[PDB]
From TrEMBL, chains A, B, C, D:
Name this protein carries in UniProt: Hydroxylase
Source organism of this protein record: Mycobacterium tuberculosis (strain ATCC 25618 / H37Rv)
Transmembrane residue ranges: none
Sites where the protein binds FMN 1: 108, 110, 113, 133, 245
Acyl-CoA dehydrogenase C-terminal domain: residues covered: 219-350
Keyword Oxidoreductase listed: yes
GO terms of molecular function: acyl-CoA dehydrogenase activity; flavin adenine dinucleotide binding
Positions annotated to bind FMN 2: 108, 110, 133
Keywords: Flavoprotein, FMN, Nucleotide-binding, Oxidoreductase
Gene Ontology cellular component terms for the protein in this record: cytoplasm
Domain of life (superkingdom): Bacteria
Gene3D superfamilies (alphabetical): Acyl-CoA dehydrogenase/oxidase, N-terminal domain, Butyryl-CoA Dehydrogenase, subunit A, domain 2, Butyryl-CoA Dehydrogenase, subunit A, domain 3
Pfam families (UniProt xref): Acyl-CoA_dh_2, Acyl-CoA_dh_N
Any Gene Ontology biological process: fatty acid beta-oxidation using acyl-CoA dehydrogenase
Length: 371, 371, 371, 371
């Protein structure tokens, strides 16, 4: 059966375990198992490592669907399928070592907080990376660093078991993502596990032509969109039956509630429609000879930021409409709200991420290397 | 050639004549002729009357494109292709009398301000209708009215001939729409020119299964969306070279301008994407045996209203960014701003039009006869 | 010596204990003692009971200043000084029994969830009331109920020790307010501990002429306004030295941060200025023969709701500006944000509370008995 | 007779003539006479020229009251009383020649668009200044320029006589302000009529210690605030009796109208309270030995910008609520809306004018010479 069908069954499992996911700040072993068996943690790795090489719009749709069940579970998918793309940047040898025959789930932090000095055979890298989503269930972490004098950063492929995982993920929401800090202490990395994203993939097929920084941003949008849909579902369910003490008209019988529901539904539908429209436009040209153009990359970053922010606006409105119900820890809207306003802090999709795409639109000078 | 190509060429003619359109509060005869030649003022009339019977997504796209050239010209298309749908509600006799062989352009006011007495072979109708967009170049006006005792309103097909057109269209914007008041003074209308929208079309093909009230609302969305895209285009052109003669930065080099352009471009792209998504979903089920369901109709009204409101927000932001430039009558953004904030007053797509679609979403009792 | 000065000092103690306040969901005994010794938990009780009978603007300024140190502690003041007004509604006998000689701290839940049936010399009452802020440190709770089958509700003064306090206050924010649910089970209340707010106070001096429902709503605004000032203070402190990449381009040096700081500072200051302006206008006419008029009462509720919502907007903007800093449990802004978005759920100051003051502004029929 | 009472009487005369003011793009001679006789066009000139030397809060209150009657007439007072301040910067001779014995009304454009070559006796200046509000009824225009090669601009006091007034004020709103372009062509100006605002006033009394750039900005705030109050007045009066055809309600009987009326009224009241709060605080320290500090100047610019932008938001909400009524030229709200969205373009109070006051709030390096 198609992976989208699988994803939508796993969403329902994630929803059933969402209290435990939050409590333990990690996915239960058997939810991870389901996710692994459906191919969703390696969906975007290349064919050579026994992986679906799933088209980006389908993969992002899967992440959105899981996020509707539970934002943290969906985010773990987003990060796993973004990190998975970097498997296509490794020389065949190290790629086969780490992900061959269906093995390897990847985490990844882009911030180049490592310092790598070169030695015979590779480099020695040290550093501390926060926000290592999914590290609890990943084998490998792709981590950013600077090698020697070099001013353009690099990526090293690290084994989790060479790293120290620090218990730092004490957060408003997205608690189940376990995005703890990781520490490398003079870890040796063979040369064939060091690469530069800017040199581009070794596996040169359309999935890896799709803008890689765009995909990362979109994956955060997929998780936020699915979370916001769940929030509208929560409010609609509550509003039919929620009755005042004094004024007995239900929540749903208030014209303001009706206006707000309509406003939120159309704002979310708009953001989601732009999201998949720009993904498909970029997927089509990822099949062409030339690099996907700056114009197209920009459209992906515009839509991803718009999706995360619109999603936060939608969840905030649903939370506010629920009033005193939602302030309590037992209320589902509470967690959607907390998760929505943790997702907005991400650097790829915050308010500041609108400015560079504005520069591109206004035909102003712009460093678009990471667009 | 495709009618969409014709539409974009007519958009550039409308743009070139936009000052005269506004000054005269009417489209120039030559623009009407071009519009008429391309089939755009009758695009959605049935095959029988020598008309394209154009699919709704294509028709609405043409209106959007003309509105990019000039909002008033685009609105005229919008109202002509919405009124044209009612040609499918006329018995074959009156239909061929008024629209046969390629003749007849329609205007239409839905507000049932007419008062109609039954007589032998028809009715005699009186009333005054405002907002008769396009009456300057229409032959026929479909007008709402109540017949005798009835609580459900009806529609009469009137010849502009029998009508007193009053000079009342002195407005902030959409001046070229000439949406004057029309008066009927004891006008006899034969019975085969009286019908009820609620009894459904006579021509029972998919274009006329498409929700007719939803089409009306969307047509205003189309005009607003096209006008908003022109406003962004105006700002981007202005900001390239506007330097405040007090600082060392053009307008385009200010971080705030960049953020605002990106916010507006993504908000518009999202509204447009939703607009055409729901039209295509409704278009598909318009081919099915059953009437298009309330759920589908609701999405069209949700997206129509979101498109007009978002469009206004977008134009307001571009107007504001342009500062002291835009306050002057010679500035293109001034007119986009005036037009955008005339379009928002329309009853199908104002803030109040969110409430009923909200009642539908919260599964509350709702009169959805005109959804 | 001046109670405003004491409020400031107690604010800084509340801030030093804010982690413990949150952890324990109650104020530490020693902070309660400070608050008691300053007169802040009884500041608005009549002078007959050895209380300051403090003017409403001074009392509300004290609540706001405590809230700046810690929102929950300030909220406790707000609810204490609002409930304390009802001491003026008790017959002199029961008033000296419960509050004589400086004794008694009051809590109060207005919702008439109680059912009371008249028996001999009084009533017996049962019910469950949520949101009993401060019950951990109050002796008396004023609880709303319906007596027999009257349609206008009454208030019973209950001893906390006759109630069952359920552990239900598990919430996004305002954790230290310990606003648990309280249950009465066939509690007997003597008749001179039963009254109706609508019959007016026994102590007929200006403080008790000041609109009582207005005071309650304003007390929520005072806590939200103080929390919001602390959020801005938190962001300004952080923004000076939050450096991005791996070196210097601080958060404070971004145009958007500057524009956002300015927007928030003027919005808060505007809300605060309207808050104290309407309090002082109402204070003056509370000295006149007639009841404070509906027009004045209305201005109080408009200002209170504006203060709470604007405060939430401010805190949300400061939280967002702080990005990945604020998602972590050790960040001050996280708690301001959680607290700000618990305060907004309160029924006196939520978005729905705009509608009735709107009806008064539009001179529409309105039931203003609880304005 | 107190000047605030004269102002509020003159407001009703301006109201009665507002159609003529807009048609002619100038105040009628009879209105100018009333204004001149009340002392409002010279209210802030020093005592030595037979002027009230009116405290700034009283002056700005008068400007706000006139703007409520008609925004353009209020704007004319705003500009006259801001320009009048510069009479305190002239040496005693030419103050006497230009303004002595109660003569002289001043206009003023701060933009240093003039180029002044020094000669014997003074300078020769040429330039073209847009936005010369009130030039139609002013005798003198203070205009910005650079003298020789200085980097700090200067001000010349020009007689309208020696200027070409060009007919360029064709604008969305504020039409009555006749803020035309003025051209100086090799105009000789005695050294006596050349000064730098930065050297400070010659008349060193509190009114001229009050921040002069702050006063200019606030004066635009006063006009925008008065205009916004009139827009709410317009709406409330319309909404009592506006019933649609099938609305089963008036506009006032809709929940959304009520909530919006209350939102707009509190937002305006908040902006107005902050406005006069910071004026009074700045007025107090204008009596102290030192210059008014930067933190105080900053608060005036914050409040000024918040007043103009909030006023625009208020007028847009009232316009939108009025729906199809307000689109027509005969609708009072239409002109309030056009005027409100003309005033927002002013450089002292646009969105960009939030950035410098943000830099002061975040204690960032800032050029505060024109704050
Ligand atoms: C819940 C959450 C999870 C995140 N996960 C990642 C991740 O797996 N990889 C990554 O490069 N960034 C992730 N980020 C964003 C990073 O915070 C970012 O690299 C950086 O620390 C932003 O802070 P700065 O202003 O100091 O540059 C995540 C953010 C959030 C809020
Ligand atoms: C109606 C109106 C009247 C104005 N009057 C004046 C004036 O009398 N003196 C002045 O220095 N600026 C005045 N301005 C300010 C200009 O509009 C504003 O500076 C301009 O939009 C910004 O120009 P810049 O980009 O070159 O800095 C006025 C603005 C408006 C909208
Ligand atoms: C943190 C918090 C504390 C509150 N404290 C009180 C209180 O001490 N007394 C009171 O009448 N309401 C208080 N409220 C308001 C009540 O929460 C509100 O009346 C109740 O939830 C409405 O319930 P309903 O929707 O079932 O009618 C508080 C609200 C919050 C969010
Ligand atoms: C520029 C403009 C053109 C319009 N044209 C039409 C039209 O051709 N047919 C129609 O039924 N409504 C049209 N409307 C909608 C009207 O705003 C609305 O039907 C009516 O004015 C108000 O009815 P009421 O009395 O119930 O408020 C138009 C609105 C605008 C702003």
């Amino acid at each position: 059966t198609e992976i989208e069908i699988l994803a939508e069954k796993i969403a329902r499992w994630a929803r059933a375990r969402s209290a435990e996911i939050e409590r333990d700040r990690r996915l239960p072993d058997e939810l991870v198992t389901r996710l692994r068996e459906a191919g969703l943690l390696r969906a975007t790795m290349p064919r050579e490592v026994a992986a679906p090489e799933l088209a980006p719009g389908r993969a992002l749709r899967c992440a959105e669907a899981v996020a509707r069940g539970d934002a943290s579970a969906g985010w773990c998918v987003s990060i796993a399928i973004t990190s998975a793309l970097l498997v296509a940047y490794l020389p065949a040898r190290s790629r086969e070592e780490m992900f061959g025959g269906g093995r390897g789930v990847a985490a990844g932090v882009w911030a180049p907080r490592g310092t790598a000095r070169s030695v015979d055979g590779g480099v020695v890298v040290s550093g501390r990376w926060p926000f290592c989503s999914g590290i609890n269930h990943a084998d490998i972490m792709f981590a950013g660093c600077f090698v020697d004098d070099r001013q353009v950063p690099s990526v090293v492929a690290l084994n989790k078991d060479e790293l120290q995982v620090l218990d730092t993920w004490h957060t408003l929401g997205l608690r189940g993502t376990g995005s703890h800090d990781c520490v490398a202490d003079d870890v040796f990395v063979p040369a064939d596990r060091v690469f530069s994203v800017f040199d581009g993939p070794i596996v040169d097929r359309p999935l890896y032509r799709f803008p890689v920084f765009g995909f990362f941003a979109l994956s955060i949008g997929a998780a936020a969109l699915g979370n916001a849909r769940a929030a509208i579902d929560d409010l609609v369910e509550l509003a039919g039956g929620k009755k005042g003490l004094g004024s007995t008209r239900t929540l749903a019988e208030r014209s303001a509630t009706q206006a707000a529901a309509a406003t939120a539904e159309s704002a979310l539908g708009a953001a989601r429609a732009l999201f998949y429209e720009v993904i498909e436009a970029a997927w089509q040209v990822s099949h062409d000879a030339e690099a996907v153009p700056v114009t197209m990359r920009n459209r992906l970053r515009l839509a991803a930021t718009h999706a995360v922010r619109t999603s936060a606006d939608v969840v905030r409105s649903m939370y506010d409409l629920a009033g005193g119900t939602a302030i309590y820890d037992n209320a589902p809207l509470q967690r959607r709200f907390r998760d929505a306003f943790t997702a907005t802090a991400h650097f790829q999709v915050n308010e500041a991420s609108r400015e560079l795409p504005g520069r591109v639109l206004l035909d102003q000078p712009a460093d678009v290397s990471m667009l």
